[PDB]
C-alpha cells in the first residue's frame, strides 16, 4: 500500500515535531551566550525533522552529492504520468432508458532513453493507480473550530511567521472525527489560508458509482496516510480483473556481446 496524494491530513508534519524546547538557566540568573547556542542547536534539529532524514539529503545541504552506489539505492531511469478518460454508454430498454454506464480506456506511451549498463543486474518496471483524495464529510477548519480568536482569523504576518506549529484534531476537519491521542497531528500556523477543500453535497452521500472516501479516513497516522483499496469497492461492478487492467507491448532492444545460436551448437 502506497500513500495518498498530498493534502492537509495525508501529508502532516512528521511525528518527531516539537512545539517546545527547554533550557537549564539558573535560579536567578541566565547566560545569554548560552541562549544563543541553544537556538543554533534547535535549528539543526529542525532541519533533520523537515528536510534531512536520509543520508543523501544531509550531504546535499552542504552542497555535495552522492552516487547511487554510496547509499546502495536503485537508480531511476524514467517516470511517466497521465490521466485516464473514457466515454459513456446509454441504456435503450424499458427499465434502463435514461441511465448510463461509464468505461475508461486510455492509450499510453512509456519511453526510456538509451542506457549504458555498467554491471550485471536487472531492470524493473512498476505501475501505480490512484484517485484524488476527496472525502464526503470534510469541512473548513474555521467552520470546524467554531469560536475564532484574533490569531485564527486576522492573518497577521508577525503572528503567522513567529509561532510554533499548532496541534489540531480530526474533529476540526471531519464530521464525527476523533479527539484522542491517535487523532491528533500538527500543521502550520495558518495553513487554512493557503488552501481550500472540496465540497460534496449531502445528496451524493452513500451513492454507488462515485469514487469517494465515504466519511473520513480512519485509523492512526500510519493508517491515515496509506491508501485502502477496499473503500473503492462501491464504485465498480464485481469482476475477476480487480479494479484496473491493462494490456501493453514492451519493445526492448539491446546491443549484446553474445555468440550466435549457430556458434553455440556447432563444435567446430
Amino acid at each position: 500500500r502506497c500513500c495518498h496524494l498530498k493534502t492537509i491530513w495525508s501529508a502532516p508534519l512528521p511525528p518527531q515535531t516539537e512545539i517546545a524546547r527547554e533550557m537549564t538557566t539558573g535560579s536567578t540568573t541566565i547566560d545569554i551566550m548560552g541562549l544563543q547556542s541553544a537556538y543554533a542547536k534547535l535549528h539543526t534539529d529542525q532541519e533533520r525533522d523537515y528536510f534531512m532524514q536520509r543520508y543523501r539529503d544531509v550531504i546535499s545541504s552542504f552542497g555535495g552529492k552522492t552516487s547511487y552506489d554510496a547509499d546502495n539505492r536503485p537508480l531511476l531511469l524514467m517516470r511517466s504520468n497521465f490521466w485516464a478518460s473514457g466515454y459513456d454508454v446509454d441504456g435503450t430498454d424499458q427499465t434502463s432508458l435514461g441511465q448510463f454506464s461509464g468505461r475508461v480506456q486510455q492509450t499510453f506511451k512509456h519511453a526510456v532513453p538509451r542506457f549504458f549498463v555498467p554491471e550485471h543486474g536487472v531492470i524493473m518496471t512498476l505501475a501505480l493507480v490512484r484517485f484524488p483524495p476527496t472525502c464526503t464529510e470534510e469541512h473548513h477548519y474555521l467552520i470546524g473550530k467554531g469560536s475564532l480568536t484574533y490569531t485564527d482569523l486576522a492573518g497577521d504576518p508577525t503572528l503567522v511567521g513567529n509561532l510554533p506549529p499548532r496541534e489540531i484534531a480530526m474533529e476540526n476537519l471531519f464530521r464525527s472525527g476523533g479527539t484522542g491521542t491517535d487523532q491528533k497531528f500538527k500543521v502550520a500556523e495558518s495553513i487554512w489560508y493557503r488552501y481550500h477543500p472540496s465540497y460534496v453535497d449531502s445528496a451524493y452521500h452513500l451513492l454507488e458509482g462515485f469514487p469517494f472516501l465515504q466519511g473520513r479516513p480512519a485509523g492512526n497516522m500510519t493508517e491515515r496516510v496509506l491508501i485502502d483499496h477496499t473503500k473503492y469497492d462501491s464504485c465498480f461492478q464485481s469482476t475477476q480483473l480487480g479494479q484496473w487492467n491493462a494490456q501493453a507491448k514492451f519493445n526492448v532492444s539491446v546491443y549484446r556481446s553474445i555468440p550466435t545460436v549457430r556458434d553455440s551448437i556447432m563444435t567446430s
Partner: peptide
Amino acid sequence: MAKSYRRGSSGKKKGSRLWYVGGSQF
C-alpha cells in the same frame, strides 16, 4: 482501435537466427 499491443507477441527481428529445426517448416 489497438494496433501495436494486439498484433504480434514480440518486436521486429533484426539480428541472428534463433531457431533451427532441421529445415523449412512454415
